[PDB]
Write a protein that binds this DNA or RNA. Structure first.
Ligand SMILES: [K+]
Ligand SMILES: [K+]
Ligand SMILES: [K+]
Ligand SMILES: [Mg+2]
Lengths: 111, 54, 75, 31, 119, 90, 167, 161
RNA sequence: GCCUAAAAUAGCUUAAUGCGUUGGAGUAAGGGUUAAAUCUGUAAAAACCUUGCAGAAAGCCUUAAAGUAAAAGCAGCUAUUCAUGCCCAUAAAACAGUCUAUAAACGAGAGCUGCGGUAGCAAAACGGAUUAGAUACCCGUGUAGUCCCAGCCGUAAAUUAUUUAUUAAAUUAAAGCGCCUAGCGAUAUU
């Protein structure tokens, strides 16, 4: 039952595809820890909900547990990202665009 | 019992929409004149809201 | 109607684009169909032969791709 | 049915068709 | 049912356009229906020119009308378009009857009762 | 990377009148793309094809690129600029 | 502007609906007398009545459109099915069989005479006899043969010979 | 597509054997790996050459496939993808929206719903309802904008005011 | 409520092609073969820009058919009539089966009668070649036919035998039928 949440987890946090995992081990990596917590809390929230006269389909298609765990696991994933390769910042990208704009203007001025 | 309530809900909504419906020629002439005096943009530029029913 | 602009007098470059348009946009296929008429039962057999040739080519290069991936062959 | 069986029947059908056409425009049919 | 008419007319004056629209409207009213939407888009340039035996029209005036009427109205409207010579091309398409399905209405009813039940 | 519309958008805007919207599913030469390229469900593939065919009948689309109508791109941009200015002023 | 309730009623009513929908609505209302309860739509009394009403409405339909062979074949299939349902009811539940015949104005010709029988069942000494069964049993006799024709020309005669309430 | 830890078993002249820990041993070219892919070393003895991986070390590899015609897992060296570069920029933009920072963008052309503004490879939408017609006229020059709303990372939709 | 390569009915769109077609401009070929010729032109063709008229067919989507339309078969657009298929919500206390001796209906292409139409293609036919001969294959013209409406004809190498249980299939055991008994040989008779 807990293999369905991984698709969303990898989509929102692609950096979890870089952390190496030991297949033949009993220790759970960060990705597996999130899945187990989602399974546990999903049932808990559903049970701990006031009952109403009728059942609504909109509630059946909601998942507040995923949002809660994402907030909790946000700081931990940040450390994993730092362990990966660095990338150019926003300021550097804008500078590169400005230089290319100036080059285009110079070519127009020449011609 | 719920289906009957749903039918009444649909009836209530249609009454509000009926305020802008035309069934007399006097209103038809006014609507035509107003439409011609205020043209709209076509689908070549801006997406149009496609009607889904009443 | 495909329009290919000639830049710096490179006519050969323009000719290459025209051939690409014909293949991508299915002009060669229309000419082949209208060269002569075939019955629907004979057209079915003709399509099978063309697909069979395409599949054989795909299989052959599938074998080559695996060798390159594993042995890192520079072909 | 095999191709050989089809060919054996083919010759006899041709002969019958040829004879019928010949008698199509005759007063006394040849039989 | 609910029908929508899209008409391409010659780029003539407003009076001519109004007359063509009025003919369709009266036909619907006479049969026992009603009109919901009337809109015009002005003169538009087409993808390719419409050709008549000795005339070429690279542009046309476009307007639309939505109405509800019995199933026999389609033939009547088609006849009017053919007779009128200021109309170049037309099409009539049927639309869904209701905006909301029965399931959606039930969900709204259930939600309202739950709020009342909680209250 | 190229823009892709959501299936909810397609079902809400798949009409023969929205020529601009329908253009995303046509090849540069003006032909209909196959389903393996559009990434659409079978019901949505049928609707898009029918909308394009109906638009062609109404002269809102051309079956192929036309050399005598190459100025329309200029016309559409000019019309778009005026409409944006008018609405902004209003 | 004021709201027009009279327009809403027309739209929600059967006025602006296809012909088939209007006909089906009348069929359900016509079975309000023989249904078991307010929501019965599947009892044998209701099913047979609905099939009979459909046949009556279809007679004028195929007199104008004589080339819609697909619709006729569907009608022919339902025609034979209704006969077998009535045959079962008569053998097992006569009182229900009697009500259906009386309500729809049919005739008691739904027995199973068998191989050695020459007439219909429930024939009293005073009642008259016919040759309807002899034609069906000894159908190979040349006296009962006809000429090849179209489906409608052959089906229309059989449909009217079973319902006596159609002109 | 997932990275796994594999242990070096044999190092021959032509090929090197790796143990993914799942099923039959995998094969990799002798000089494909480098010392930068090692996470655990058998010994602390310093290595001299970049292409110096000794048996017993643990290396990070990318699982290209699970089933292969050879009968063993396919393992390849990890690579990079620009998607991370865009993701890092997107995270920065999200932080700016939370902190009510002013973003710099360059207008490129006019759009159906508004004007297209590019922000380090991301093209945003600027509805005409929130334009003074002076910023719209300025095309190709950086201008200050306030981010109002944004979609999920996959959608890549930004609305500027 | 929606959907449909289902059937019947009625309106609408044109890419290309043809010509005892309009006007402008221009001058020797166009067409075809293994190689040639018949044929079409120089008394103004083909090619190029324009005008008019006409019939048939439906590029991309498009893929099996995964619709299975009962089979024969089925995708240019829109609408009507009608029959299906999908979701959501209901219904039946007694009724509904398999198979077919016999009987009936539907039924490609070709063909026949009448009415309308005839661009492209093309039996027959008439010429030019090939060849020992070519009565065929190849090239140039080209009538029925192919098309519409109303009738006739009922024939195909016109799909895998039908049903129950098991089964991915299969296999195993049963229910009701049709057909075969070496080949060869009829325009027999009725
Ligand atoms: K036939
Ligand atoms: K055959
Ligand atoms: K035998
Ligand atoms: Mg018949």
């Amino acid at each position: 039952p807990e293999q369905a949440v991984y698709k969303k987890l990898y989509r929102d946090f692609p950096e979890l595809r870089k952390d190496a995992v030991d297949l033949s081990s009993l220790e759970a990596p960060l990705a597996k820890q999130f899945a187990l917590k989602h399974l546990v809390l999903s049932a808990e929230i559903a049970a701990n909900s006031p009952r109403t006269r009728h059942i609504l389909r909109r509630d059946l298609e909601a998942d507040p547990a995923y949002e809660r765990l994402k907030e909790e696991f946000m700081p931990r994933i940040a450390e994993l990202r730092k362990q990966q390769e660095q990338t150019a910042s926003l300021q550097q990208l804008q500078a590169d665009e400005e230089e290319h704009l100036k080059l285009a203007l110079t070519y127009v001025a020449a011609q | 019992r719920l289906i009957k309530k749903a039918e009444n809900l649909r009836y209530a909504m249609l009454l509000e929409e009926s305020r802008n419906w035309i069934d007399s020629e006097e209103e038809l002439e006014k609507r035509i004149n107003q439409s011609l005096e205020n043209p709209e943009a076509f689908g070549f530029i801006v997406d149009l809201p496609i009607a889904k029913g009443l | 109607a495909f329009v290919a602009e000639v830049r710096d007098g490179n006519v050969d470059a323009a000719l290459a684009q025209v051939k690409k348009y014909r293949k991508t946009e299915g002009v060669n296929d229309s000419v082949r169909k209208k060269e002569y008429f075939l019955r629907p039962s004979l057209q079915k057999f003709r399509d099978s032969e063309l697909t069979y040739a395409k599949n054989m080519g795909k299989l052959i290069h599938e074998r080559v791709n695996w060798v390159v991936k594993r042995k890192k062959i520079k072909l | 049915i095999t191709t050989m069986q089809w060919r054996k029947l083919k010759i006899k059908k041709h002969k019958l068709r040829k004879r019928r056409k010949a008698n199509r425009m005759r007063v006394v049919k040849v039989r | 049912p609910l029908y929508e008419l899209l008409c391409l007319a010659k780029p003539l004056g407003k009076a001519e356009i109004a007359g063509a629209m009025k003919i369709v409207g009266q036909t619907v009213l006479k049969r026992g229906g009603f009109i919901t939407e009337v809109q015009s888009y002005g003169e538009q340039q087409l993808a390719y020119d419409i050709r008549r035996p000795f005339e070429i029209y690279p542009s046309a005036h476009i307007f639309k009308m939505e109405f509800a009427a019995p199933t026999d109205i389609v033939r009547l409207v088609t006849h009017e378009m053919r007779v009128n010579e200021n109309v170049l091309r037309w099409v009539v398409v049927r639309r869904p009857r209701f905006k909301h399905t029965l399931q959606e209405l039930l969900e709204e009813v259930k939600a309202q009762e739950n709020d009342d039940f909680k209250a | 990377f190229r823009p892709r519309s959501t299936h909810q958008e397609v079902t809400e805007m798949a009409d023969f009148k929205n020529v601009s919207f329908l253009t995303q599913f046509l090849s540069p030469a003006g032909r209909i793309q196959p389903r393996r390229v559009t990434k659409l469900t079978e019901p949505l593939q049928r609707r898009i094809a029918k909308s394009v065919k109906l638009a062609r009948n109404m002269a809102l689309m051309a079956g192929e690129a036309r050399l005598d109508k190459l100025h329309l791109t200029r016309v559409r941009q000019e019309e778009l600029h005026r409409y944006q200015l008018k609405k902004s002023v209003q | 502007q004021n709201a027009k309730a009279h327009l809403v009623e027309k739209f929600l009513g059967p006025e602006f609906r296809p012909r088939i929908k209007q006909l089906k609505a009348k069929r359900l209302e016509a079975v309000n007398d023989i249904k078991r309860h307010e929501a019965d739509v599947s009892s044998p009394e209701v099913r047979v009545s609905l099939m009979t009403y459909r046949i009556r409405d279809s007679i004028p339909l195929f007199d104008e459109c004589k080339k819609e062979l697909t619709g006729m074949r569907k009608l022919e299939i339902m025609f034979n099915k209704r006969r077998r349902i009535l045959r079962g009811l008569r053998k097992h539940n006569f009182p229900i069989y009697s009500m259906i015949i009386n309500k729809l104005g049919m005739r008691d010709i739904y027995s199973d005479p068998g191989x050695x029988x020459x007439x219909x069942x429930x024939x009293x000494x005073x009642x008259x006899x016919x040759x309807x069964x002899x034609x069906x049993x000894x159908x190979x006799x040349x006296x009962x043969x006809x000429x090849x024709x179209x489906x409608x020309x052959x089906x229309x005669x059989x449909x009217x010979x079973x319902x006596x309430x159609x002109x | 597509g997932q990275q796994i830890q594999a242990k070096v078993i044999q190092k021959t002249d032509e090929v090197m054997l790796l143990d993914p820990g799942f099923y039959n041993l995998s094969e990799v070219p002798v000089n494909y790996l480098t010392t930068a892919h090692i996470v655990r070393k058998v010994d602390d003895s310093p290595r001299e050459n970049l292409y110096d991986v000794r048996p017993g070390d643990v290396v990070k590899v990318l699982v290209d496939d699970v089933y292969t015609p050879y009968g063993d897992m396919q393992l390849d060296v990890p690579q990079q993808d620009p998607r991370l570069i865009l993701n890092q920029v997107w995270d920065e933009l999200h932080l700016k929206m939370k902190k009510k920072e002013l973003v710099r963008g360059r207008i490129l052309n006019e759009c159906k719903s508004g004007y297209a503004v590019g922000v380090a490879g991301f093209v945003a939408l600027l509805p005409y309802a929130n334009t003074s017609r002076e910023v719209a006229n300025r095309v190709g020059e950086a201008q200050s904008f306030q981010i109002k709303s944004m979609s999920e990372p996959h959608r890549r939709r930004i609305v500027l005011q």
